């Protein structure tokens, strides 16, 4: 899947 | 699905 | 799952 | 997430 | 995440 | 999380 979110 | 929040 | 966001 | 309070 | 706030 | 912020 895409990247997670930023911190 | 999309990774996880980031640090 | 996707890679963590970034910091 | 942002980080803390400076100092 | 973005740095936090100034102290 | 992000790093913290300045002084």
Known sequence: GP???PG
């Open 3 to 5: 990247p997670g979110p």
